[PDB]
Symmetry: D2
Subunit: 188 residues, 4 copies
């Protein structure tokens, strides 16, 4: 038995710095404005933690987890079978390659672009359904800069939320995670 | 409306009362919700936590306790608007009014009304096996005493300080505006 | 009767949202790598709180505070008199106009651009002394973006520090932390 | 070396010990320093706060208390490196060793070493009129207790939680890396 959202980060097969951590994952899910029956793309899925929890939010939605890295693909395989996330389909693809075969998306999360950010945004803009939402998480200045630029260029309203989290595990010292910029884009 | 992430301005609320959207999502995460559970929301305010919790537990039962008459009207209006039928609004000044409720799997404490120790004691007696208590604190006194009382009762306690800054406007002047920090306190028994 | 740095925000003649607030002001001064005998420009001075505290840190240094808003020039004239900042010269100008007549700077603080950010950065770059340091404070994404771009274009090493401050007033424990908006302090220098 | 804002890597220090430069600047700011004052730095660590405070008060008098042998090593190395002649290193564990110091105008508590309550009480009996106490706290326990004990003694307390995240100098991959939060607690009568 796992919670609907808020699965502990340690339960995912992952690498250091790869996982969308629990708290930011929850905010990311929230920004995606999910409802049942939608199609969602998770570009650069990593460990697929965002996909897995989104699948719990949309039991009859369809989630397409895209990842090109062989090590990460192994993580995802192990996770999808641990968490019984049957409405998630793993797709081996270097986005924007592999998107043409996917059904039109209501929701797109961009966890990793692999140097292809502008190309992914353009490809997604052409495919995104009416009332669609794009969410990206960014930890670097260049990705933050360029994502805001490219989304605004396509006429998206854009919100940027910078989320800082510090936690005590005794002696309770607050340890900070690095900041995550959750960028949310839609048509008004 | 989405399952979670309903815009703050869609709720009938007062200034400084609502559990704002980002922090709400983290709070629900920390609550470790699954369907069919019983949840108490003590000091419900606008009941935004109760309402999104109810979306995550369609077959669960949520009990939202609120003492303030102005906030009761907000709740009534919100429950109807968002169709949160599995939330029962309970008019009470907790720990009063907890007795008629079923034992909780999950308790969120959003407001104590000067009754923090008494609420934690009452909740601790009732809390089911593998239960989780979450509290959102914005003052240092609440943060200090909540950690102190929960640790007295043998709970494992995590504190997560969540700082959110967001842009708005439309373009050009995309300035980050900070929310005030919120301390999300999660307590559970390491035993169970 | 006033400290070297950490002068209360209230003691400056100022407008709402104008002042570089105390904590951020302190970090800004720290990033400015101040030592005595230097020339500093403070572009878009506001109330000149940055110029004033820098003046305490460099008593034998020379500071030029540029501002053209007539109201703010009043604030600066008041504040320079109140705090006895004699080594600060008020310059009535909207940068990059009014920079030509100034001595070559070792340090430049850009507190306000008036939409002339690129032109200000270009002007400053041509003039900045060896081992010089530029500091800017950005609150918008657009300023953050363009500043980093324009400074990297001119070949500077650029550090961005995002500073978040949340404070209790006065009851302290019975009293919510109130957050200031984040400030991006951008520090630029040649390696 | 600058008057304030000396790069953290220039001090002899250990992991997690130094008052990092941004927070150090805010701390000096909160200390309300002016020349000719007497300051105590209790649990001085690497003495980075005392050193930069020395620059702010050349004719002031700073007493840096430390008795961890490794940290005393760092301090001696640092004072020699930065020319901070108005800093006296005092080998002691507060509140003992405070009786040998002159009455302070300013007190920074950087490390209490389990003696927080006793330190605040001893400081309170000695602090000069218009004096300022500053403490940097990173645990909830220290935050809680400092605030309680300072208000117990009739101080007006400000707590400023400072979060700093920063990139590096290189253009390639500018990721914001967070320092842990620091609660800078300022107290005055
Ligand atoms: Cl992940
Ligand atoms: Cl609410
Ligand atoms: Cl100013
Ligand atoms: Cl130090």
């Amino acid at each position: 038995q796992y919670p609907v959202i808020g699965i502990d980060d340690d339960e995912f097969a992952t690498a250091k710095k790869l996982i969308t951590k629990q708290e930011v994952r929850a905010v990311t899910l929230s920004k995606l404005r999910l409802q049942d029956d939608l199609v969602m793309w998770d570009i650069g899925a990593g460990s697929a933690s965002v996909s897995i929890e989104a699948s719990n939010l949309m039991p009859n939605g369809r989630i397409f987890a895209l990842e090109r890295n062989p090590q990460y693909l192994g993580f995802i395989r192990d996770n999808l079978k641990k968490f019984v996330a049957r409405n998630v389909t793993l797709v081996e693809a270097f986005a924007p390659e592999g998107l043409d075969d996917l059904p039109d998306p209501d929701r797109v999360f961009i966890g990793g672009s692999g140097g292809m950010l502008e190309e992914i945004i353009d490809a997604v803009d052409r495919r995104l359904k009416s009332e669609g939402v794009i969410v990206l998480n960014a930890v670097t200045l260049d990705t933050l800069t360029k994502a805001v630029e490219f989304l605004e260029d396509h006429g998206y309203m854009v919100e940027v939320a910078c989320v800082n989290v510090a936690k005590t595990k005794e002696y309770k010292m607050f340890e900070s995670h690095n900041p995550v910029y959750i960028i949310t884009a839609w048509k008004s």
